[PDB]
Amino acid sequence: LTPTMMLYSGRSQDGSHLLKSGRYLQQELPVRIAHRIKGFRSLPFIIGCNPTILHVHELYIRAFQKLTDFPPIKDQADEAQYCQLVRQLLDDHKDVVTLLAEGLRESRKHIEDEKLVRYFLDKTLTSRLGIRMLATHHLALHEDKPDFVGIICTRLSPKKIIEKWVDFARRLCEHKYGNAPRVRINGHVAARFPFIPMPLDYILPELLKNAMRATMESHLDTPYNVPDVVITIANNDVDLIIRISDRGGGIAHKDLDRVMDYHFTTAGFGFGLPTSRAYAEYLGGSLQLQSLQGIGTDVYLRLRHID
């Protein structure tokens, strides 16, 4: 399970579990989308009038209409068509973070309660993650993948998923700078346990891109020889901790109280850190920074295990 939301682990050769899951989504999705729409309705007028914000507001209204127009699921044929709707919505909404980032960029500067936008984005993006997790889990229940129950991996290796995003981040970095730091991984490198990959897929590349950028920009004279990024995995009975340590110079004292703000960037829209922290906390984890100004930064991602 996740916040106020359960990921069904059920199984059935008759397929009765798919119907129960689908009926659950049918009950749950319209209510959560309605909460998002209320979020839009309460946005400060001048922000809500932004055409890009209006577009996203309308997307959610359409989603609500489609979800509520769909008849109650009674058989596999109904459930099958519901999945088509769910797939369409997942796709129609895939650029929502980007659209909100852009819609909010300028319009936020008007109102003076800066807490409002942070609150709306935390609430909106985490609810969205939860919705996409539930929806994707349902679809995945149809899949035949070993080591997976829906989107839940029954034996996830933290080292493997980290290496996947390391390779991705390294490619982006090389394309921009001509090279990328090597990454070393230490600690509980052989750990395997049940876990939902999706949050890691969102968070890890954000933290890795940050570490690599900082490392390259502080070693412009020696791009062919930069300090490794060092990742430590700690696996205990309560949580999984992933520490990502770089020698990229640290986060400056003058920037320290701003790096967690949406739209703050020293370079994207400056979303990597605030979104990653909102997601971690939404799931009962946390994201903490330790800056060693002049040396580097340690970032600690903590995510709870599955009970």
Added chain:
Amino acid sequence: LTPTMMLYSGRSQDGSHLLKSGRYLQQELPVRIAHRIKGFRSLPFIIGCNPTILHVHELYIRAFQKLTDFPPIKDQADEAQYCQLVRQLLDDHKDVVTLLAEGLRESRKHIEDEKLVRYFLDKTLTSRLGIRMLATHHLALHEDKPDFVGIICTRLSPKKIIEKWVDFARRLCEHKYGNAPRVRINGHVAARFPFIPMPLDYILPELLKNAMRATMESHLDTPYNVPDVVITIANNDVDLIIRISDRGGGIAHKDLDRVMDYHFTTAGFGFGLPTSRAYAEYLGGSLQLQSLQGIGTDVYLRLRHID
């Protein structure tokens, strides 16, 4: 300068700076000791009645009496005798932390506001540190040491002072376990800057003893081969950061919210962490912990530079 307190850097071949410093102490010390006595008077009755607490309470009353009985300093002869008094008090009060630790151990368990004892100890021990710093600075103004203005070092090497306490902590550890982790020091190893050693002399051995203990107790099967403790020095224009990282297994989740409490220990009286944090914060710095349960702990000491 330090909190509401200035360490005089003055100089004079006539020695007029010693008189000005001494008169400053004469003004300042009785007032601060009076505040400590008020602290004792406000302690919960049942704690204040403890014979060891009463003994310390009386020590401070005697100090106040001696300080206020001393006539106004007018010449070098007066100043010279005042230093004798200051030396006597520094010596008479050298075991105060220990006496308070013991006096408070049981008696604190009676009252239910646990915040009270923490507050009294933070306030009492930091004020005491400040007093001992001011007093020792004054005495040291008579000394002829190169690279020192009183207790202020004009070119302190963080690496050197760390190595001094490493050797000390390693000896204690070897005596208890038969071996000690090696310590590596990296980062700004060649840094030198004006700094007051005294807080580092209090804090560093406390953090090093913790790291070494944890390392030895988690490697009982291989005491002859344990993970190094790794210390990173970061020196910037705002602060000095010293990170002490061990592979001693971490601080358990169940203990995490208690390790900063006076008297909490899994083994002294459990004072190393709460005192070290109070001292750091008293000076405008901080002490932060990052636990990787199952792996180790990172401890970050931050102390502000001298303006």
